Write a protein that holds these residues in place. Structure first.
Motif, PDB file in Angstrom:
ATOM      1  N   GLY A 116       0.759  -0.912  -0.122  1.00 12.09           N
ATOM      2  CA  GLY A 116      -0.115   0.104  -0.033  1.00 12.09           C
ATOM      3  C   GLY A 116       0.704   1.288   0.065  1.00 12.09           C
TER       4      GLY A 116
ATOM      5  N   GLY B 234      -0.342   4.016   1.171  1.00 12.04           N
ATOM      6  CA  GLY B 234      -0.506   4.668   2.520  1.00 12.04           C
ATOM      7  C   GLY B 234       0.319   3.847   3.720  1.00 12.04           C
TER       8      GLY B 234
ATOM      9  N   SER C 294       0.752  -3.104  -4.374  1.00 16.71           N
ATOM     10  CA  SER C 294      -0.649  -3.005  -4.110  1.00 16.71           C
ATOM     11  C   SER C 294      -1.427  -3.260  -5.206  1.00 16.71           C
ATOM     12  CB  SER C 294      -0.893  -1.727  -3.217  1.00 16.71           C
ATOM     13  OG  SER C 294      -0.737  -0.705  -4.259  1.00 16.71           O
TER      14      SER C 294
ATOM     15  N   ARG D 140      -6.658   9.543   1.824  1.00 21.85           N
ATOM     16  CA  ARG D 140      -6.276   9.107   0.298  1.00 21.85           C
ATOM     17  C   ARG D 140      -6.239   7.702   0.211  1.00 21.85           C
ATOM     18  NH1 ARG D 140      -4.764  12.353  -3.315  1.00 21.85           N
ATOM     19  NH2 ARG D 140      -3.404  14.550  -3.145  1.00 21.85           N
ATOM     20  N   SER D 141      -5.820   7.075   1.180  1.00 25.58           N
ATOM     21  CA  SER D 141      -5.530   5.676   1.158  1.00 25.58           C
ATOM     22  C   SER D 141      -6.404   4.571   0.829  1.00 25.58           C
ATOM     23  CB  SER D 141      -4.355   5.254   2.099  1.00 25.58           C
ATOM     24  OG  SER D 141      -4.052   4.071   2.246  1.00 25.58           O
ATOM     25  N   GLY D 142      -6.513   3.668   0.257  1.00 27.22           N
ATOM     26  CA  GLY D 142      -7.519   2.481   0.086  1.00 27.22           C
ATOM     27  C   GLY D 142      -7.346   1.668   1.156  1.00 27.22           C
ATOM     28  N   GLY D 143      -5.943   1.042   1.189  1.00 28.67           N
ATOM     29  CA  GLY D 143      -5.381   0.180   2.303  1.00 28.67           C
ATOM     30  C   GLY D 143      -5.758   0.716   3.662  1.00 28.67           C
TER      31      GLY D 143
ATOM     32  N   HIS E 118       1.622   7.082  -3.795  1.00 25.94           N
ATOM     33  CA  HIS E 118       0.620   7.998  -4.278  1.00 25.94           C
ATOM     34  C   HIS E 118       1.206   9.250  -5.111  1.00 25.94           C
ATOM     35  CE1 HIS E 118      -1.910   6.752  -0.634  1.00 25.94           C
ATOM     36  NE2 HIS E 118      -2.070   6.069  -1.569  1.00 25.94           N
TER      37      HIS E 118
HETATM   38  O1  LIG Z   1      -4.125   3.832  -1.533  1.00 22.33           O
HETATM   39  P1  LIG Z   1      -3.078   2.486  -1.123  1.00 22.33           P
HETATM   40  O2  LIG Z   1      -2.562   2.923   0.255  1.00 22.33           O
HETATM   41  O3  LIG Z   1      -4.199   1.092  -0.911  1.00 22.33           O
HETATM   42  O4  LIG Z   1      -1.809   2.187  -2.086  1.00 22.33           O
END
Ligand SMILES: O=P([O-])(O)O
Ligand SMILES: O=P([O-])(O)O
Ligand SMILES: O=P([O-])(O)O
Ligand code: NA
Ligand code: NA
Lengths: 420, 324
Positions: free
Chosen positions: A270, A272, A297, B176-179, B274
């Protein structure tokens, strides 16, 4: 992401592709010098180096080159060679980045007055592109997403304070510059200074960024465009390899080396979580030992995750560290990445590198949730048992970043939480 | 800002792309949320001819129509006001522009990573003209417990049940982040009465909808009693929260942590995963934004490690005063 390009790359594109009535002078009259340059061949290729005095400067994504004393102005070729002698190959700290000065650009010196110098900059925002102009507090104009920028627009909004006899040539050049900026998907373009004399327009300086995601649109015009590392870092073949994997797939595969010799390596899922883990490592005093930033990811396959992990494992078994090394295999509770498939790829890499990992005294800490995570955690625990590599495996019931404090010795390892 | 409410238990969506696993996950969620009907009315996929695809509604096999052409899907499903676009990066721009020729569509989720910023700005311009809310690009989407789940967000039933995502609590979030949004589902479910709505705005430089866009929606939604923002290095969006508090527009408690504090300690510039996560000025660093938020009265933990503790403390104070 937006990526900086060298001054030479930007000028090559500008001279090839800009459309303006202005007579741009000295097109393609630049010469690149590195510590490997053969000066006789350089001169064979660029005989204009003898024809007038010269300007020399780094072209390594260093800004404020003039104020750093890094521009040699109005020099003979012998004077350039003398100016390069203490600088070419030298260490330089700029701000707080430290690297080596290894890429320079030589161009003709252009005699001109301070009144013949101008500043032009274009840069992207959500609402459009701002165009800045200063004669030398700059005039500034927002160009909306669907707006054109014609010469009459530039005269009206930007050239109010420009010398009357230069407004036409400035407006034509800036209009052509803006169209070039759009057509080649620039996000930032600065010319500091632009010179206009009685003989025409000279581009004395350029810094720029392009939106690298637009390669599928722009590749015919960009060609094999180079995106250098920021000053203070090197580029590594392992980074290019991961970038090539990333380009082939909807899955995200990213790797940046910060310190190849560091003892703290991450392999985190991820965009994030990878940042959060990096934050935690640095909060606990590990910045000087953090070897990498990166992430995977978007549901990579077992094979993609294998190719990713083997790159890391190779990188961390290049030379021993007295205190051994740590590998942090972390992540959020995933939404849809298959944790069994991805962790089976990592486990296969661990098996292929078990000898080197043991020789380099690697300890592995794992925290992950998501689809099939229980089987993912099981295969991690099992590869530790079969190889003898110490691996500490945690699931959704352990706080995401807890394994960092464990790995760095700030908190005990809670065996009562294994596999949960 | 745009609509306060994007989704309800009556939301119907078209899914662009052959994404049968994501659709079935939505239907599994719909079922345990006790929705009357599947949230996916139709799929659009130009690489096959029109056909019906089998899915499951509980134990029951059902059929969802797949259309080669978007115009046929829209015409046959006027009840749809959401499109979830799984188009590849190469064609996401065109298919999203196409979707916005249909007045029925009021919200669009754009999944793909890698759309050029200049194309996304044109999508934003058209969406702003029309009042369409865009979530994304480069996102898993979001989730509104009891009502609607965007695509893969929140995963399969085991995670929906574990994090109590089958009924709304009182806590709204944006990241912002999906995870990390699914990590927030977990944290919030353990510290409070649970998620009311969560949105992942995606990783790109110009998100189709911003942190402040969604914070304002949550401020204006009576069921939301507190708001969590997982911010990030890059850009200056989070200062709008400081401004909204100062102005008296934002009165519900806000908890915020911005990730990317490590960048301050690095000697060179680092582009994180990101696309938008790169600080081009001192004001864009996570350290700077976290400090400004704390000074404006946002509840800012010492680090990500204390985020759960601060969420639980704000929540318990709101119970004590009868807000929850
Ligand atoms: O948006 P991410 O954290 O799932 O790469
Ligand atoms: O040396 P720079 O700041 O004019 O690019
Ligand atoms: O509710 P179900 O799973 O028996 O159809
Ligand atoms: Na990719
Ligand atoms: Na991602």
């Amino acid at each position: 992401s937006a990526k900086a390009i060298s001054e030479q790359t930007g000028k090559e594109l500008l001279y090839k592709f800009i459309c303006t009535t202005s007579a741009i002078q000295n097109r393609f009259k630049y010469a690149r010098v590195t510590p490997d340059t053969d000066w006789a061949r350089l001169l064979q290729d660029h005989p204009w180096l003898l024809s007038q005095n010269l300007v020399v400067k780094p072209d390594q994504l260093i800004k404020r080159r003039g104020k750093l004393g890094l521009v040699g102005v109005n020099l003979t070729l012998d004077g350039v060679k003398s100016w390069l002698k203490p600088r070419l190959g030298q260490e330089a700290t700029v701000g707080k980045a430290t690297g080596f000065l290894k890429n320079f650009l030589i161009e003709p010196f252009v005699p001109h007055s301070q009144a013949e110098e101008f500043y032009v900059c274009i840069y992207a925002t959500r609402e459009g592109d701002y165009v800045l102009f200063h004669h030398e507090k700059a005039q500034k104009l927002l160009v909306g997403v669907d707006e054109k920028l014609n010469p009459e627009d530039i005269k009206k909004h930007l050239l109010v304070h420009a010398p009357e006899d230069k407004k036409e040539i400035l407006a034509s050049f800036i209009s052509g510059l803006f169209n070039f900026y759009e057509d080649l998907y620039f996000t930032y373009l600065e010319i500091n200074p632009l010179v206009v004399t009685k003989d025409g327009v000279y581009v004395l300086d350029l810094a720029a960024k392009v939106d690298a995601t637009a390669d599928y649109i722009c590749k015919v015009k960009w060609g094999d465009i180079e995106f250098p590392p920021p000053f203070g870092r090197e580029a590594y073949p392992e980074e290019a390899y991961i970038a090539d994997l990333d380009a082939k797939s909807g899955a995200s595969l990213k790797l940046t080396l910060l310190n190849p010799k560091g003892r703290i390596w991450t392999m985190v899922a991820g965009g994030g979580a990878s940042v959060v883990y990096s934050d935690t490592i640095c909060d606990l005093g590990g910045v000087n030992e953090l070897a990498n930033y990166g992430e995977y990811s978007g549901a990579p396959s077992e094979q993609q995750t294998y190719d990713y992990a083997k790159t890391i494992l190779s990188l961390m078994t290049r030379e021993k560290h007295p205190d051994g090394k740590i590998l942090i295999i972390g992540g959020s509770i995933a939404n849809f990445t298959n944790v069994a498939a991805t962790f089976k790829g990592i486990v296969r890499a661990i098996r292929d590198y078990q000898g080197p990992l043991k020789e380099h005294e690697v300890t592995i800490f794992v925290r992950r949730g998501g689809p099939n995570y229980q089987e993912g955690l099981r295969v991690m625990g099992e590869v530790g048992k079969t190889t003898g590599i110490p691996i500490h495996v945690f699931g959704t019931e352990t706080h995401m970043t807890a394994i960092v404090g464990m790995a760095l010795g700030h908190r005990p390892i809670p065996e009562n939480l294994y596999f949960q | 800002s745009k609509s306060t409410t994007l989704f309800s238990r009556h939301t119907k969506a078209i899914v662009w792309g052959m994404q049968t696993r994501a659709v079935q996950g939505m239907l599994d969620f719909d079922y345990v949320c006790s929705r009357d009907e599947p949230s996916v009315a139709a799929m659009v996929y130009p690489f096959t001819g029109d056909h019906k695809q089998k899915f499951y509604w509980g134990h029951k096999e059902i059929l969802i129509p797949v259309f080669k052409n978007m115009a046929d899907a829209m015409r046959k499903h006027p009840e749809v006001d959401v499109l979830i676009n799984f188009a590849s990066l190469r064609s996401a721009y065109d298919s999203t522009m196409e979707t916005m020729n249909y007045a029925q569509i009021r919200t669009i989720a754009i999944i793909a990573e890698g759309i050029p910023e200049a194309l996304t700005r044109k999508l934003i311009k058209k969406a702003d003209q029309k009042g369409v809310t865009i979530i994304g690009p480069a996102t898993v989407g979001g989730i509104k417990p009891g009502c609607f789940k965007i695509g893969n967000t929140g995963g399969m039933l085991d995670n929906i049940l574990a994090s109590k995502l089958y009924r709304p609590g009182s806590v709204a979030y944006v990241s912002r982040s999906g995870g990390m949004s699914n990590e927030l589902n977990n944290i919030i479910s353990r510290t409070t009465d649970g998620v009311y709505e969560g949105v992942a705005i995606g990783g790109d430089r110009y998100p189709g909808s911003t942190f402040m866009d969604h914070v304002l929606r949550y401020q204006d939604t009576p069921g939301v009693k507190m708001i969590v923002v997982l911010g990030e290095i890059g850009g200056t969006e989070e200062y709008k929260i400081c401004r909204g508090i100062k102005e008296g527009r934002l009165t519900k408690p806000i908890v915020c942590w911005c990730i990317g504090t490590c960048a301050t300690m690095f000697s060179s510039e680092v582009q994180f995963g990101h696309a938008g996560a790169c600080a081009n000025q001192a004001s864009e660093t996570a350290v700077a934004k976290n400090q400004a938020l704390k000074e404006a009265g946002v509840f800012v933990p010492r680090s990500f490690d204390e985020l759960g503790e601060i969420i639980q403390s704000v929540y318990e104070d709101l119970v004590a005063n009868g807000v929850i």
